[PDB]
Amino acid sequence: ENIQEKIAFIFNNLSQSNMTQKVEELKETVKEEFMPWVSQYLVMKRVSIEPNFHSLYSNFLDTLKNPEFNKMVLNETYRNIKVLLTSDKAAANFSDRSLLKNLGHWLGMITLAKNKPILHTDLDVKSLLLEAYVKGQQELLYVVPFVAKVLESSIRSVVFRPPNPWTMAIMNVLAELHQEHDLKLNLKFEIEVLCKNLALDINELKPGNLLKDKDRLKNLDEQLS
Amino acid sequence: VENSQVICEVWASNLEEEMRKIREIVLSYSYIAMDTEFPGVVVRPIGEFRSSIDYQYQLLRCNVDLLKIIQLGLTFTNEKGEYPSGINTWQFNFKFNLTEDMYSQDSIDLLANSGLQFQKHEEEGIDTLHFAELLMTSGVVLCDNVKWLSFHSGYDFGYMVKLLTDSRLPEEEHEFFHILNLFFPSIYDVKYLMKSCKNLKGGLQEVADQLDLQRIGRQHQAGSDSLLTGMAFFRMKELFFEDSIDDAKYCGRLYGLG
Amino acid sequence: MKRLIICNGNKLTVCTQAEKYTPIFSLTKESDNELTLELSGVARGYYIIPSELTSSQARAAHLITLLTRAEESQTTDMHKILNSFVSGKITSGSMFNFENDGSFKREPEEAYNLINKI
Ligand SMILES: [Mg+2]
């Protein structure tokens, strides 16, 4: 338990200036066995409630240079997103909504901005959006801002820049949701903000008819609840 | 030959069904042999194109930016050389209209002789954008354990860089190989390994006789040539290189471009 | 007799053998989207654009048809390159060779060597 406080102390006063020295302190203090605890602590107690200090943690991951630890962090993030998504969607869970938004931002920062993909066996985004549309109005509030946050970091990826087929695949679905007359002004303005951030034109996109395929929407894989 | 239980044709109908068995097959069987069928070379470059490597790159670029893919064959193997218990080659067939597309009649004619169905390609064919969208979130591309294998893959890796980025290829080779390294990190090229070998020279079929390998399928196709590429590499590495492919010299390079 | 098309950025020049090549007509793409015709070599006359037909896309298509001796209800293999250039799929200095009938040059050795990976 004494070590448990040292990890918190190390993460508390992190700065760009002392990043290397604090990394050395952490490598000296924490063991190999206790690394999963640090991964869960960083993704559950530090990243997900503090959206302002995110570049610091990405730089910490880069400086540490531990692919096993990076995989542990990514897996814990995916598990947390799944737990939040497949939960009782209470209409007043603003804390949960912010939690999901911040975790999605972190996911987009540590996968898309690192020129790595979001694996389908771990999380599918287009199917998530279609299921959100088919389930009702509550799940859209959870999904559309989360997907916008994930795609926000695509502009910093030379692989996942707008002309990427996958990014346009997600963006055309979001454009359809934008065109939907039953969607709310909040979600519509969020989609427009994402389009501005990616420097696209909502009028220049190529929306399809994915929301009109009842047969496809019936047999969707269930990542929600 | 056997092109039924070892080679699976992927149309636009069974694309998501046969892409589900690729994600679950790439996890344990990582090496992917690659072949691409395309309508040939049709446009020549002009200018102050010295640096025969640079000339080769521009000859690649001028043709890739205008011609459209017609077939892509992938074969899955593990380190030792075993195959994934049944279907191990996928032959993706794309869209191609023989009346409103770009082609050279000396390539289309012999491909039609080989057996490609240009009436079926027009109706049931995979759209490149959809294929790329399914490819990015599959783990086949952009991963680190996947080690691609190919034979004289100048145009093979350019057509899919265009397909996977939906943009024209970069002007110089510096920005082409940089993005190729991000997409496919390991580019073991059998021909580059060949131009270090004692006697092995020629083409694919002219070396499949020297290596004593039997071709499974029909010639000049995509799926039945990726299998021969894979078997050729797993014989060359075993026999000449003493079970080692040195990363520094023979990896990440192509024939002509490197 | 052979024909050639040179795409030097904004200029699409069509030329005929006479391997010296004499240009017949050149299309210039203006600032935004305008297309201009510069029939040359004979420098005017001879090949005559018919009445009515005035648009640059149509004059160039008719001239290519008259050069290739092709049928009216035909989109020949030079017409396809013209259309690709106008639509903007040829944005670089490039060279396209053709026979008299309009298809790309027959290159059996290159095709056979490029399909056998030689
Ligand atoms: Mg081939």
Side-chain angles (χ1 to χ4, degrees):
Chain A
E1 218 169 283
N2 329 315
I3 296 317
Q4 263 195 55
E5 291 103 32
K6 179 70 71 153
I7 308 135
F9 154 82
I10 271 175
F11 272 86
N12 244 335
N13 39 19
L14 206 64
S15 325
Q16 286 274 343
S17 60
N18 296 5
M19 168 154 273
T20 325
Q21 176 214 299
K22 303 219 82 62
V23 160
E24 252 76 55
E25 305 179 42
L26 185 139
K27 274 298 301 200
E28 188 40 72
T29 326
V30 317
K31 329 339 169 171
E32 190 45 82
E33 156 175 330
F34 270 54
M35 275 284 179
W37 191 96
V38 173
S39 148
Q40 144 182 0
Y41 177 81
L42 154 59
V43 187
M44 287 195 31
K45 248 77 180 184
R46 278 300 194 288
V47 148
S48 186
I49 66 151
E50 288 180 349
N52 303 324
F53 315 139
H54 265 180
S55 94
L56 250 63
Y57 295 142
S58 173
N59 288 167
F60 179 89
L61 262 61
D62 288 359
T63 281
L64 185 74
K65 273 309 291 184
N66 209 353
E68 174 75 40
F69 186 69
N70 299 4
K71 221 108 188 176
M72 281 173 10
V73 162
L74 189 46
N75 268 16
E76 171 46 3
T77 299
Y78 276 129
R79 178 181 81 80
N80 243 102
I81 270 176
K82 293 272 181 33
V83 159
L84 261 157
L85 274 182
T86 81
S87 67
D88 255 321
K89 320 288 224 314
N93 247 5
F94 270 83
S95 83
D96 263 12
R97 199 167 318 158
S98 287
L99 257 162
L100 191 48
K101 286 195 288 259
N102 297 346
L103 273 170
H105 196 181
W106 179 251
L107 185 31
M109 174 162 29
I110 68 174
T111 51
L112 284 88
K114 294 252 171 273
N115 287 332
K116 289 197 338 301
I118 290 179
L119 289 191
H120 192 293
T121 59
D122 287 325
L123 191 92
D124 191 4
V125 179
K126 191 178 168 3
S127 179
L128 171 46
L129 282 155
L130 298 164
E131 204 177 5
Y133 180 81
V134 85
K135 265 198 192 335
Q137 199 164 167
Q138 264 297 320
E139 279 83 351
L140 278 156
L141 273 90
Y142 279 62
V143 169
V144 170
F146 152 83
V147 170
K149 284 332 201 293
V150 168
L151 288 183
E152 222 195 11
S153 310
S154 95
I155 200 59
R156 286 160 31 209
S157 192
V158 318
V159 159
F160 283 91
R161 256 169 205 286
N164 215 18
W166 174 81
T167 308
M168 310 305 317
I170 312 294
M171 281 285 288
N172 285 322
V173 180
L174 275 170
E176 277 155 34
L177 282 163
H178 175 272
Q179 280 190 331
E180 196 24 77
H181 54 276
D182 294 326
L183 231 82
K184 307 143 87 141
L185 304 151
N186 295 335
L187 281 319
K188 273 151 83 74
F189 170 82
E190 182 63 59
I191 291 161
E192 274 192 46
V193 156
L194 171 65
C195 293
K196 169 50 159 336
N197 234 301
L198 284 210
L200 278 197
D201 209 9
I202 190 86
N203 284 2
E204 286 169 35
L205 294 169
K206 317 184 231 133
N209 309 300
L210 255 294
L211 295 190
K212 304 301 115 183
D213 294 353
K214 144 263 178 173
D215 255 350
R216 186 64 64 186
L217 270 63
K218 173 195 56 56
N219 77 4
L220 277 168
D221 34 40
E222 191 132 289
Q223 325 194 236
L224 285 211
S225 178
Chain B
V1 313
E2 199 85 339
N3 51 315
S4 93
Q5 45 153 205
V6 201
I7 276 192
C8 209
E9 281 106 0
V10 192
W11 301 109
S13 95
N14 61 348
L15 174 59
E16 275 158 289
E17 165 204 296
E18 294 268 330
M19 210 84 214
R20 200 149 331 125
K21 344 165 167 174
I22 291 206
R23 322 187 214 257
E24 309 197 13
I25 204 176
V26 68
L27 288 192
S28 187
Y29 302 74
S30 62
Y31 293 60
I32 317 187
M34 180 109 97
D35 189 358
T36 299
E37 289 301 319
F38 60 103
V41 154
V42 85
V43 48
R44 300 295 191 196
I46 58 173
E48 201 37 75
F49 277 165
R50 288 303 277 130
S51 323
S52 196
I53 285 178
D54 170 5
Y55 171 41
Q56 192 40 52
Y57 175 60
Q58 313 284 350
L59 187 44
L60 189 164
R61 188 170 63 86
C62 278
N63 299 263
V64 163
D65 288 344
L66 193 83
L67 301 157
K68 269 186 319 164
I69 205 155
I70 52 176
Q71 248 191 353
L72 171 83
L74 309 170
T75 299
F76 286 81
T77 310
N78 61 339
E79 281 151 0
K80 295 95 193 162
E82 305 116 13
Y83 284 93
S85 188
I87 290 203
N88 56 52
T89 279
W90 277 271
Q91 207 185 137
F92 297 93
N93 306 7
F94 290 91
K95 213 165 205 328
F96 196 74
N97 206 326
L98 202 33
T99 310
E100 314 181 1
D101 272 16
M102 281 315 169
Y103 58 82
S104 178
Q105 199 90 330
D106 291 327
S107 267
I108 277 274
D109 220 353
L110 85 83
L111 282 180
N113 293 359
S114 288
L116 283 93
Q117 293 195 259
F118 290 108
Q119 161 91 341
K120 188 76 153 294
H121 269 61
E122 147 164 316
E123 326 168 25
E124 337 306 356
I126 295 168
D127 253 343
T128 87
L129 274 83
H130 195 5
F131 179 49
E133 141 188 346
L134 289 170
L135 211 62
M136 311 215 88
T137 83
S138 157
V140 162
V141 70
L142 275 144
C143 268
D144 220 308
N145 39 314
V146 180
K147 311 249 181 41
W148 303 74
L149 326 173
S150 51
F151 198 122
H152 195 90
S153 52
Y155 312 82
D156 304 338
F157 282 119
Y159 272 96
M160 327 179 29
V161 151
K162 173 184 92 133
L163 164 138
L164 272 188
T165 68
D166 204 350
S167 96
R168 344 273 291 280
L169 265 64
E171 179 70 24
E172 29 265 53
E173 281 166 320
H174 299 177
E175 310 145 38
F176 176 54
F177 279 67
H178 155 64
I179 198 96
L180 197 72
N181 280 5
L182 266 61
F183 278 102
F184 325 115
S186 303
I187 314 282
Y188 295 109
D189 196 287
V190 189
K191 220 156 185 336
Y192 212 129
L193 323 191
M194 247 182 218
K195 64 162 301 313
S196 100
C197 284
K198 318 296 210 323
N199 314 313
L200 260 43
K201 275 175 259 63
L204 192 36
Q205 202 55 42
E206 293 131 355
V207 86
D209 223 357
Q210 321 194 25
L211 288 167
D212 231 12
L213 289 185
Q214 332 274 19
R215 170 176 290 275
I216 298 185
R218 281 149 102 268
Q219 314 194 359
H220 304 282
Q221 266 188 341
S224 183
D225 232 354
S226 64
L227 254 173
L228 210 35
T229 286
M231 303 188 258
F233 175 21
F234 280 104
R235 274 211 81 170
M236 255 174 26
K237 135 177 165 156
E238 153 183 42
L239 202 135
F240 283 170
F241 294 126
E242 193 73 5
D243 161 357
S244 77
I245 304 300
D246 190 34
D247 233 324
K249 337 194 201 144
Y250 300 141
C251 165
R253 289 158 192 76
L254 282 60
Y255 201 59
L257 301 203
Chain C
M1 274 262 272
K2 296 175 33 67
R3 318 230 182 278
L4 178 53
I5 282 197
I6 301 118
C7 312
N8 244 1
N10 58 309
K11 265 188 80 147
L12 185 99
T13 316
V14 174
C15 316
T16 71
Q17 192 199 245
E19 280 257 356
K20 303 328 296 162
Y21 275 131
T22 87
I24 282 296
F25 93 116
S26 313
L27 271 193
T28 74
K29 204 140 62 157
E30 283 276 28
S31 56
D32 35 15
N33 65 96
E34 286 173 356
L35 283 210
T36 326
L37 202 62
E38 194 139 53
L39 320 97
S40 45
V42 310
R44 256 164 186 168
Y46 210 125
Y47 297 178
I48 27 88
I49 274 301
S51 149
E52 192 38 65
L53 204 69
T54 280
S55 59
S56 289
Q57 221 63 8
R59 301 174 80 86
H62 182 88
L63 226 64
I64 287 189
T65 286
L66 243 196
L67 254 199
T68 57
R69 252 180 301 261
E71 315 311 314
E72 179 58 89
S73 286
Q74 194 182 352
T75 279
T76 68
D77 205 75
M78 262 165 78
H79 292 90
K80 300 176 205 161
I81 284 299
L82 166 39
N83 263 305
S84 284
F85 158 67
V86 156
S87 276
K89 269 82 160 171
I90 325 161
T91 56
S92 48
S94 55
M95 162 156 268
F96 302 86
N97 255 282
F98 301 95
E99 276 84 38
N100 205 340
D101 56 74
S103 39
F104 291 103
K105 182 157 182 31
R106 224 69 61 205
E107 289 261 304
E109 301 277 271
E110 199 210 11
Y112 174 85
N113 282 30
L114 194 125
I115 283 183
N116 290 14
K117 324 208 102 164
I118 293 201

